Amino acid sequence: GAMGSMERASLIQKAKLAEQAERYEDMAAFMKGAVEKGEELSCEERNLLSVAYKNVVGGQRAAWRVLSSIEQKSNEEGSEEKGPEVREYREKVETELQGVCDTVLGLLDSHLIKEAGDAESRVFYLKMKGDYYRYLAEVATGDDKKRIIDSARSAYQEAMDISKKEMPPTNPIRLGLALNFSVFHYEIANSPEEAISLAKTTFDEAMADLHTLSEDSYKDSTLIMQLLRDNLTLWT
């Protein structure tokens, strides 16, 4: 690995620099390098890892959607034949996206998840596992679409089980997990009623626990609650 020769602390320092410079591919490579040092990650370090890869895959997802839409339009009546280029280029972007997802899932499997024993770490990593299977599901169109969906669901469910046992209802990791699992249900699993039910229950139980929080923790929880509400407005 190209980062094998760089100190862990230096990789973290450079990931932060790359974040400031909006160099997210670099940021991801630095954080991969840090993970591969084999030490567990702190809360802040998990955040750097998450930000880096979310930005990389987010660019890929946006591009894939543009290309898929062009492709879909070319495969209708009245549409002039234009050769294999749109499909080829969509496939190229798709393959790169799957590559990034497989890299993240590889880090989680080797060995972030198994070493994570605290609730905050374990729930964060399992959420991440669900998210990156979800991204794979967005582009899957084969035998394995079903199995990918089940992998995402399994990761999210395991995370949900721990979060409900171990964290308060306002915990931001717990809230973001529930938000993303509700998106999984609505957008991937064709279960809009499960999506709405989860979003409603999560919102209501968080609302009732806000009183326990400091002003700063309150700010964090209510941010995610607003997104649950925005989705509920969208979905109903």
Binding site: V51, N180, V183, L227
Partner: peptide, 9 residues
């Protein structure tokens, strides 16, 4: 319109 998932901090 697509559903909103968790943002970056």
């Amino acid at each position: 319109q697509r559903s909103t998932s968790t943002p970056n901090v």
